[PDB]
């Protein structure tokens, strides 16, 4: 509790509070940018999935986990990895592909030989279909996607700004699509692989929507978290400020005494 220390101690917190307050305001603008891509993706989810509402399609499991590589955003990855283990109880031997490292790191520790593929370099900018297609493609590629009895994507749904929600959603494959109760209503010409395509493109599209929602749920979290960091380092600064003045003060008195005593003699 020397003065030298307390000073620099108090500095590096001010310097932290700065960064955290920059973080918060930067997220505010970034959430505005990812707000419009969560309306333009959750609308294309409308036109797409409505066909599925009319021909009610009801579904070696493939779970795809979605987050990012970024920390500093509260329990985004922590509590998504938990709902993925909650559902990974009922099928201990279900394959996972993870998008974003923080989730991979989480599950890698608990279902370490479930995962077969992993993607990275994600939650930096807003996700685009270009990615959402390449991951869908590689899911078809190495992962043998259509040849799976069942596929479900796991993502963080954004309920408000302050709170998000771990969520799940079903992908259905070629066979499920043909076999759906009201498929008969739709005069889709059996003119060559037609349900296949619908699947291959509902895998990219569904994936996108999830990613858009996941990212915009994460940005909210990052914002809120960084926000509290600023409040705390704010309160810490206050404490150390008070401690600083004490030490200063005594440094003056103890220093002075040394002289007074030297002087009386």
């Amino acid at each position: 509790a020397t003065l030298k220390e307390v000073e620099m101690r108090l500095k590096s917190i001010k310097n932290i509070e700065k960064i955290t307050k920059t973080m918060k305001i930067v997220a505010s603008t970034r959430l505005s940018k990812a707000e419009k891509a969560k309306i333009s993706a959750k609308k294309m989810d409308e036109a797409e999935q409505l066909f599925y509402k009319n021909a009610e399609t009801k579904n070696k499991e493939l779970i795809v986990a979605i987050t990012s590589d970024k920390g500093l955003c509260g329990s985004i990855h922590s509590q998504l990895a938990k709902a993925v283990r909650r559902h990974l109880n009922d099928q201990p031997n279900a394959d996972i592909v993870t998008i974003g490292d923080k989730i991979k790191m989480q599950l890698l520790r608990t279902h370490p030989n479930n995962i077969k593929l992993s993607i990275n370099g994600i939650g930096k900018d807003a996700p685009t279909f270009q990615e959402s297609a390449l991951i869908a493609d590689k899911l078809l590629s190495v992962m043998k996607a259509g040849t799976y009895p069942k596929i479900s994507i796991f993502y963080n749904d954004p309920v408000s700004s302050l709170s998000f929600e771990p969520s799940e959603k079903p992908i259905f494959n070629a066979k499920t699509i043909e076999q759906s109760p009201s498929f008969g209503k739709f005069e889709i010409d059996t003119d060559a692989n037609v349900p296949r395509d619908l699947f291959e493109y509902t895998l990219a599209n569904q994936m996108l929507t999830a990613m858009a929602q996941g990212y915009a749920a994460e940005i909210s979290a990052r914002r809120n978290a960084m926000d509290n960091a600023s409040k705390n380092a704010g309160d810490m600064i206050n404490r150390y400020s008070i401690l600083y003045n004490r030490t200063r003060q005594a440094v003056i008195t103890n220093e002075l005494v040394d002289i007074i005593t030297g002087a009386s003699s």
């Binding site: 008070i242 003045n245 004490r246 200063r248 003060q249 003056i252 008195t253 002075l256 007074i260």
Partner: protein
Amino acid sequence: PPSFAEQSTSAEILETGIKVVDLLAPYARGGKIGLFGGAGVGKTVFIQELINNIAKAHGGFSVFTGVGERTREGNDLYREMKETGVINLEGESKVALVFGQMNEPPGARARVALTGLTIAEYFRDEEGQDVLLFIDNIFRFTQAGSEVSALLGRIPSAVGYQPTLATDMGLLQERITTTKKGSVTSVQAVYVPADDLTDPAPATTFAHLDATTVLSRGISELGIYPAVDPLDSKSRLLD
């Protein structure tokens, strides 16, 4: 200082005529108000306003005391006062000026506060008025009292202050008060060493203040005049 007999039994507001003040941080009658803020905030204009308003509304004079004065500002003040006509070389003044500048030696700077206070105490006892005594700056009075102690070869107290620091303030402040004859209210500029409200000086000073009036740069910049901060300027007589 006026004995425990000659004491005011009730606290009482002194009307200043300034909305901010009276409404939010009302002044004690015979009380002590810590005035905060440097330059760029119209401090002297505001001071002059109170000298005028205490004279005009109530009917009592003012004594402005310059303790540890920067001489430049003494020349400014004196001119600005004439220019504002609170001083009237031809007619009548409302304010007596008692300066004790930096260049003067530690003894001088310690006593000036009393020099002025004495003058103000005459208008409360002889002429039974409600007088304004200004002290700029009550801190440098403290400072000066420290130098006197060091030169007199006495052992410094905590943080190098005069061992006498409390009673020294007491002797001063305890003459600034209401009597049955009248009242002396004081507005005292307060500097805060190293921005530390726990430093002996302000610590010991706040022990006597009844209301702070904090003018602010933020408030002047928003065009608001007087530049009193409505939120900070707190009166311990607003009950």
